[PDB]
Design an enzyme around this catalytic site. Structure first.
Site, PDB file in Angstrom:
ATOM      1  N   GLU A 286      -6.730  66.227 -18.150  1.00 21.45           N
ATOM      2  CA  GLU A 286      -6.272  67.114 -17.078  1.00 21.45           C
ATOM      3  C   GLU A 286      -5.929  66.384 -15.774  1.00 21.45           C
ATOM      4  O   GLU A 286      -6.535  65.364 -15.435  1.00 21.45           O
ATOM      5  CB  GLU A 286      -7.334  68.187 -16.801  1.00 21.45           C
ATOM      6  CG  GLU A 286      -6.865  69.298 -15.864  1.00 21.45           C
ATOM      7  CD  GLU A 286      -7.754  70.533 -15.887  1.00 21.45           C
ATOM      8  OE1 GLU A 286      -8.842  70.511 -16.504  1.00 21.45           O
ATOM      9  OE2 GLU A 286      -7.355  71.545 -15.269  1.00 21.45           O
ATOM     10  N   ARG A 290      -4.838  68.669  -6.366  1.00 20.23           N
ATOM     11  CA  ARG A 290      -5.539  69.081  -5.166  1.00 20.23           C
ATOM     12  C   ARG A 290      -6.574  68.007  -4.836  1.00 20.23           C
ATOM     13  O   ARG A 290      -6.827  67.122  -5.647  1.00 20.23           O
ATOM     14  CB  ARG A 290      -6.271  70.401  -5.416  1.00 20.23           C
ATOM     15  CG  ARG A 290      -7.076  70.391  -6.696  1.00 20.23           C
ATOM     16  CD  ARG A 290      -8.166  71.419  -6.686  1.00 20.23           C
ATOM     17  NE  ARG A 290      -8.868  71.494  -7.959  1.00 20.23           N
ATOM     18  CZ  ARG A 290      -9.969  70.814  -8.271  1.00 20.23           C
ATOM     19  NH1 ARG A 290     -10.532  69.981  -7.408  1.00 20.23           N
ATOM     20  NH2 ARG A 290     -10.522  70.987  -9.460  1.00 20.23           N
TER      21      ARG A 290
END
Ligand SMILES: Nc1ncnc2c1ncn2[C@@H]1O[C@H](COP(=O)(O)OP(=O)(O)NP(=O)(O)O)[C@@H](O)[C@H]1O
Ligand SMILES: [Mg+2]
Length: 444
Positions: A286, A290
């Protein structure tokens, strides 16, 4: 320099962002729920707007209210922190369309990397090493699904493309369970999106992740790695930087592939590539698009203020930091401090009746809490982060032990005693424990 920003978050990260803003001379607007009026960062902010009631749907996930707050205060940008709306591509879009800078990546990039199947395809194309898998969605032809399983080699794992939080996935150890495992994951993860894929199941990986910064103008750098293998219910408990056993050469290899992937997908801002690391090999699972909770350990070992870089990038400045200026020095460990009953592990709200923070060389305390502060019952259990840096890993751990003993948080239950146990754990002290260790140690 950004004139004024809305901090679209709460707790420790909101305070983290406020500090960076203050340092840079950037005016702050603290948007908060009615249950968060006494947050430290709200009390320190230049302006405050109560955007709604305690439930996050009408406060911290309330897109119209947050954007109006920016409008009424004449803010130029919005920092989403982590969690909440930070990887909501609709939010990013609406923020930009409404005339504000979104302190994060482009919405298209959030979508690309937010769906796991599309994210894996982009990484594979970019040359980032991925987990062997179906490389696309599974159908319901079970001769074909058994063939993918054989090609990958059992055990495999069925994963929901919109999946998250340790939910929407089933480990399959042979053909007999495959059909049911795919059908159920397709249901259990219908997150609303039925789409599932198949990955090779790695049986003793470590969690190793790569920090990046990219300006969205063609430049990208990597700021070494973090090991976040100490987990419970797939939730990280301890993080450290660099990762034990990772050589400079291995660091440069995976670092350069992540930086290159940033250029390929036109990434903008701070981000993290999460890998499972096993038998000397990295496997992408993943990308968090952010800032991450555990960003401080990387800041300690590189000297780079990641939040301030986010703000500079958002202001449209190209990266000033070249890769050759980024140097790993020393070692840092982070212990998450949670308002939870350690045994039952579910949140413990209430008034903090006595508080004392640790100090000293290399000791960094990231928390909004103070004596007399009431931890509300509505949000995440994490109330602070203790980060200790040393010239080596042994010194970082020694300082963490010392700091945890100084840390006083009375009036509520916390996981401080557990963090002390982990620091004193012989296998942790050696280093390189896998993602299953903490649960095995505890009996979970
Ligand atoms: N291929 C794999 N092999 C072994 N474990 C895996 C694999 N993929 C996912 N996991 C497990 O799932 C955990 C992370 O899931 P989590 O972040 O809680 O939700 P998620 O985002 O749906 N899954 P992920 O894509 O792994 O981040 C990992 O740390 C592993 O324990
Ligand atoms: Mg994601």
């Amino acid at each position: 320099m950004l004139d004024k920003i809305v901090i679209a978050n709460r707790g420790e990260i909101a305070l983290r962002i406020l500090r960076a803003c203050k340092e840079l001379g950037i005016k702050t607007v603290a948007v908060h729920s009615s249950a968060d009026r006494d947050l430290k960062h709200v009390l320190l902010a230049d302006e405050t707007v109560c955007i709604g009631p305690a439930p996050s749907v009408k406060s911290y996930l309330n897109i119209p209210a947050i954007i109006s707050a920016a409008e009424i205060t004449g803010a130029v940008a919005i920092h989403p922190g982590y969690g909440f709306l930070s990887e909501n591509a609709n939010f990013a879009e609406q923020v930009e369309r409404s005339g504000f800078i979104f302190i994060g990546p482009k919405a298209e990039t959030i979508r690309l990397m937010g769906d796991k199947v599309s994210a894996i395809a982009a990484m594979k194309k970019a040359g980032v090493p991925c987990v062997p898998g179906s490389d696309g969605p599974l159908g319901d032809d079970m001769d074909k699904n058994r063939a993918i399983a054989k090609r990958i080699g059992y055990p495999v794992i069925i994963k929901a493309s919109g999946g998250g939080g340790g939910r929407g996935m089933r480990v399959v150890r042979g053909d007999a369970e495959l059909a049911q495992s795919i059908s159920m994951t397709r249901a259990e993860a219908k997150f609303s999106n039925d789409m599932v894929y198949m990955e090779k199941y790695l049986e003793n990986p470590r969690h190793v992740e790569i920090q990046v910064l990219a300006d969205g103008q063609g430049n990208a750098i990597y700021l070494a790695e973090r090991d976040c293998s100490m987990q419970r219910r797939h939730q990280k408990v301890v993080e450290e930087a660099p990762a034990p056993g990772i050589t400079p050469e291995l660091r440069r290899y995976i670092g350069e592939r992540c930086a290159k992937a940033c250029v390929d997908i036109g990434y903008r801002g701070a981000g993290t590539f999460e890998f499972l690391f096993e038998n000397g090999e990295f496997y992408f699972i993943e990308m968090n698009t952010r800032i991450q909770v555990e960003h401080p350990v990387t800041e300690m070992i590189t000297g780079v203020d990641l939040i301030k870089e986010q703000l500079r990038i958002a202001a449209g400045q190209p990266l000033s930091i070249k890769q050759e200026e980024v140097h790993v020095r020393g070692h840092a460990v982070e212990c998450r401090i949670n308002a939870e009953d350690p045994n039952t592990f579910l949140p413990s709200p209430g008034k903090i009746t006595r508080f004392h923070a640790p100090g000293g060389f290399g000791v960094r305390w990231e928390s909004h809490i103070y004596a007399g502060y009431t931890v509300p019952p509505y949000y995440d259990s994490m109330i602070g982060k203790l980060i200790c840096y040393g010239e080596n890993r042994d010194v970082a751990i020694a300082r963490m032990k010392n700091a945890l003993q100084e840390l006083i948080i009375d009036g509520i239950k916390t996981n401080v005693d557990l963090q002390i146990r982990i620091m004193n754990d012989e296998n942790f002290q050696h280093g390189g424990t896998n993602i299953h260790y903490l649960e095995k140690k505890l009996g979970l």
